Amino acid sequence: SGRGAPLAKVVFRDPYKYRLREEIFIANEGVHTGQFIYAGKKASLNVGNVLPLGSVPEGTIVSNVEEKPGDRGALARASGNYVIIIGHNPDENKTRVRLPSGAKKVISSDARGVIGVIAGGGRVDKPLLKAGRAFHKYRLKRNSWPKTRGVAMNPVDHPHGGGNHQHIGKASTISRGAVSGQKAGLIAARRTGLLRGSQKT
Amino acid sequence: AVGKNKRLSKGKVVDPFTRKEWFDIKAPSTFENRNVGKTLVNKSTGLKSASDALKGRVVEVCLADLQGSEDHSFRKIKLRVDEVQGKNLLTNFHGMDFTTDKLRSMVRKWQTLIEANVTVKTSDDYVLRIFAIAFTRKQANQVKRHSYAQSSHIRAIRKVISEILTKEVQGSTLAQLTSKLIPEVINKEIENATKDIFPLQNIHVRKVKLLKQPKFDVGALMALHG
Amino acid sequence: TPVTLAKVIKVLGRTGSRGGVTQVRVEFLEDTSRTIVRNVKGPVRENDILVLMESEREARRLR
Amino acid sequence: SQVFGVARIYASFNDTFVHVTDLSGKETIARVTGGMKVKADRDESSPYAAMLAAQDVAAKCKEVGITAVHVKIRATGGTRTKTPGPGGQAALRALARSGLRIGRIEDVTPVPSDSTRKKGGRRGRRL
Amino acid sequence: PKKRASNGRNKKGRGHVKPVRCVNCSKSIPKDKAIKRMAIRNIVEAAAVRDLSEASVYPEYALPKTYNKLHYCVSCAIHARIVRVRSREDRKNRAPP
Amino acid sequence: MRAKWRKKRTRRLKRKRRKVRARSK
RNA sequence: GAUGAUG
RNA sequence: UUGACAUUGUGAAGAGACGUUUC
RNA sequence: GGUGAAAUUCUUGGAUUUAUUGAAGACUAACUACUGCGAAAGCAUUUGCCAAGGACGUUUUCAUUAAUCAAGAACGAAAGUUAGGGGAUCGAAGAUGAUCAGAUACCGUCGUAGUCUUAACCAUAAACUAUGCCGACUAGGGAUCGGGUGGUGUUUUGACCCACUCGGCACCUUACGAGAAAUCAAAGUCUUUGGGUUCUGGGGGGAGUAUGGUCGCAAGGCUGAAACUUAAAGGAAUUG
């Protein structure tokens, strides 16, 4: 509930006493029930396996990458998302990875990941036709819907409120140093307007 | 122009050659002439050091000048500074390439051009990309005025070349590859194997460039200089 | 500055939009067996001697 | 016997570079262009400006200690002309007559295989 | 009327021929229609061959050469005097000069 | 005038007859 | 390969 | 938000001032 | 740096030029031609995979199953449209420097949409050979691409060389013939007019316009008049 991607329940075998231990993964595309999932420094390069980043070749696509070895997954957990592996630095024990946002990090080779992409992709390309479908989406997320516009409020309620016409009155761009109660609008904006041109990354 | 400058600076001298010394570049033992020239560098002041700038700078040198005859004048070699011992610099092979004039003279019209390339690793863990070039030649007594080859031929000639290059580059070390390049041995192997497909001319190993080097071991470099 | 002398050995033709610039080849008196081609401004024949203010400027042709 | 550098003549239209370096390319011995010998923009690429520029390189290389220089001649290249400008031959001539020995000569224009699009449009420079 | 049987180009048995750019004005013209010349020259002009021999460190050094193939559009081929208007009977001739 | 530009003019003219007449629909 | 409208 | 002082120790280099040392 | 000459512009806070290394997208040079393939539009780096096709060889097989077509259908350059990705170069718009009587143009510098890719539309071009398709017949010469036959030809099965043949892209000479001429081996075998078949035209304008259908998200595509005006518009050659 409240999550676009499906989960997967994988049960391994406790290596120190006789019992079974169940673990919640996030399903990658193509993972089906009855499949065997191998996790370790010496597992193979198949979709669904949990390998360290230093143990996979360049160009691999992984998901649920942990940003320090032992955090149990941090970096690609939304539907349809993944991470690419650009390079290795054997001297420093560090790997270069491209994130879903276009950023580039350097994270330890010992950190883990799962091979593939998150299931449930393509979700945000079907319009919500109705206000009632947005109602039920957020009914299992949190209280953030509907949204009233500040410029329709009174001056007691918001920096934008008030006036014989509905208008901001001052630049909507707000200094990063602004204190709480002042930060409404665009915070620490490097530019503004319709984005024309190349990414300019 | 001399008198056209508008602003000298965005705001409102010593002779640099008094603080440099010369070094002596030395080729590896694969080549007859061990001396190739000299180069400058700033002295080893406190916040710098000569070796930190000498390391990793590349010098291109004619192969004829390394063997003793201007016949080989159409092939060049690249050497890379790896260690600075005393006042001379030691270098190791880095690649090879023809001269632009030599290559362009070979490319005449009324003949088909065949090229091939192959990525392989020598027995001492170097990775290389070797390039090859051939041409179709008129047969003696030929009346027809062009010497094109059918694409069936070109596919076979390109396949024979590819296997000779892999076979000859692996098993041999990089030094052993250099010793095969100078006598132009491979160009004679290709000729013998491509006879029954099509006659050819201007068969050459056009260039070779390194792609990845094994972790630097001092022993390797000293072996080729002592 | 020094000045060098040379001797016309052939008159090649005429140039300039209006013909007032003859073209000559010369042989330097000292250090002979060096020849240069350059332009001249008045009537000229073979065996004439020309005073060249700068020696090493070979002269272009308008055609 | 001989101390060798490398001389790079970039003979474009609109200017001509003559600048010598060490055999490794990283350190420069002297750099002087035709433009810093003439007063008018149109004469920068002229043979005479190339000749004066090369005579200063030879003067400086003598005192730094270079007694010979190889040569690499260049044009703009790429999508551009690929033909040497008016002043390339003058610089090469001037180095030879200044007392500097000449080694090898090579043309090092960048040739593009097949390349990105060329300036000017589909109908060219209409002039 | 029809001025030429070749339509001013060498295209028979093909639909399309990829374009090329002129070396002066950058105007696009199909390869088969462009005027093509192969220019080759010594790297050192005739006047300078002697002085370069004296300076040559090596004895008996063979002069390199420059090779380039040049493509002209019809307008820039007329102007540079590479081709010229030709009489009717003389237009049919194909042979070089 | 040139045939191409006359054709264009008639097109930019039809586009206007096509919308003024849309006011009565 | 600077400029040059009209009767 | 930035500087200084305390929490605050231990071994190396480069430079510097009238052996000790501060960047 | 740029030009015919310049200016805007970038540069002592290090530009242009030189060396070493790295990233991104596009493109496929020279070899490249009166050469190849495809229904046309179109197709050019290597290798592997999937299906397809012409010509040739054939003492295989079927036996009229065929030619050309209103309606109906698939594909269809560039630009253009909708939604993701990519976005390096070039660059409708736009912004600027110069030229000029003006210059909202040509020229110099920036630069959005576009240019590239996936899914889905569009249905146009000097889409040209301005030349419909199938068939038979009529003149001379040589070169080239693919297949086959003979020459144990000659250098080392292959590559060449001579003759011959089928199918192609074309080319040189000539007028039995055709045409108003330019020119044409088809545009010939048509007043000595008939091999089969499909499509289009009827002086120049108004007009590929208005109107009604129909197709498209839209730009638009297909179908498509009349009133009225007019003695000439036009094709190929000839002397100035």
From Swiss-Prot, chain B:
Cross-referenced InterPro entries: Ribosomal_eS1 (IPR001593), Ribosomal_eS1_CS (IPR018281), Ribosomal_eS1_euk (IPR027500)
Keyword Cell membrane found: no
Domain of life: Eukaryota
Assigned keywords, A-Z: Acetylation, Cytoplasm, Isopeptide bond, Phosphoprotein, Ribonucleoprotein, Ribosomal protein, Ubl conjugation
Biased composition regions of type Basic residues, renumbered to the chain: 1-12
Covalent S-S links between cysteines: none
Subcellular location: Cytoplasm
Cellular component per GO, a single term: cytosolic small ribosomal subunit
Single GO MF annotation: structural constituent of ribosome
Miscellaneous notes: Present with 92400 molecules/cell in log phase SD medium.
Protein name (Swiss-Prot/TrEMBL): Small ribosomal subunit protein eS1A
UniProtKB/Swiss-Prot annotation, chain C:
Location(s), subcellular: Cytoplasm
Gene3D superfamilies (UniProt xref): Nucleic acid-binding proteins
Principal cellular location given in the protein's record: cytoplasm
PROSITE patterns, per the entry: RIBOSOMAL_S28E
GO MF annotations, alphabetized: structural constituent of ribosome
Domain of life according to the entry: Eukaryota
UniProt xrefs under InterPro entries: NA-bd_OB-fold, Ribosomal_eS28, Ribosomal_eS28_CS
Post-translational modification note: N-terminally acetylated by acetyltransferase NatB.
Keywords: Acetylation, Cytoplasm, Ribonucleoprotein, Ribosomal protein
GO cellular component, one term: cytosolic small ribosomal subunit
Keyword Cell membrane: no
GO biological process: one example: maturation of SSU-rRNA
UniProt record similarity statement: Belongs to the eukaryotic ribosomal protein eS28 family.
Assembly and binders: Component of the small ribosomal subunit (SSU). Mature yeast ribosomes consist of a small (40S) and a large (60S) subunit. The 40S small subunit contains 1 molecule of ribosomal RNA (18S rRNA) and 33 different proteins (encoded by 57 genes). The large 60S subunit contains 3 rRNA molecules (25S, 5.8S and 5S rRNA) and 46 different proteins (encoded by 81 genes).
Stated role: Component of the ribosome, a large ribonucleoprotein complex responsible for the synthesis of proteins in the cell. The small ribosomal subunit (SSU) binds messenger RNAs (mRNAs) and translates the encoded message by selecting cognate aminoacyl-transfer RNA (tRNA) molecules. The large subunit (LSU) contains the ribosomal catalytic site termed the peptidyl transferase center (PTC), which catalyzes the formation of peptide bonds, thereby polymerizing the amino acids delivered by tRNAs into a polypeptide chain.
UniProtKB/Swiss-Prot annotation, chain D:
GO BP terms in the entry: cytoplasmic translation; maturation of SSU-rRNA from tricistronic rRNA transcript (SSU-rRNA, 5.8S rRNA, LSU-rRNA); ribosomal small subunit assembly; translation
Annotated GO MF terms: mRNA binding; structural constituent of ribosome
Annotated spans, Disordered: 107-127
Cellular compartments annotated: Cytoplasm; Nucleus, Nucleolus
UniProt feature, compositional bias: Basic residues: 118-127
PTM description: N-terminally acetylated by acetyltransferase NatA.
Annotated keywords: Acetylation, Cytoplasm, Nucleus, Ribonucleoprotein, Ribosomal protein, Ribosome biogenesis, rRNA processing
Note: Present with 29600 molecules/cell in log phase SD medium.
Similarity annotation: Belongs to the universal ribosomal protein uS11 family.
Task of the protein: Component of the ribosome, a large ribonucleoprotein complex responsible for the synthesis of proteins in the cell. The small ribosomal subunit (SSU) binds messenger RNAs (mRNAs) and translates the encoded message by selecting cognate aminoacyl-transfer RNA (tRNA) molecules. The large subunit (LSU) contains the ribosomal catalytic site termed the peptidyl transferase center (PTC), which catalyzes the formation of peptide bonds, thereby polymerizing the amino acids delivered by tRNAs into a polypeptide chain.
UniProt-recorded name of the protein: Small ribosomal subunit protein uS11A
Swiss-Prot record, chain F:
Entry keyword set: Cytoplasm, Ribonucleoprotein, Ribosomal protein
GO biological processes: cytoplasmic translation
Subcellular location: Cytoplasm
Presence of keyword Cytoplasm: yes
Family matches, as Pfam families: Ribosomal_L41 (PF05162)
Region (Disordered), start-end ranges: 1-25
GO cellular component terms given for this protein: cytosol; cytosolic large ribosomal subunit
Record note on quaternary structure: Component of the small ribosomal subunit (SSU). Mature yeast ribosomes consist of a small (40S) and a large (60S) subunit. The 40S small subunit contains 1 molecule of ribosomal RNA (18S rRNA) and 33 different proteins (encoded by 57 genes). The large 60S subunit contains 3 rRNA molecules (25S, 5.8S and 5S rRNA) and 46 different proteins (encoded by 81 genes).
Protein name according to UniProt: Small ribosomal subunit protein eS32B
Protein source organism: Saccharomyces cerevisiae (strain ATCC 204508 / S288c) (Baker's yeast)
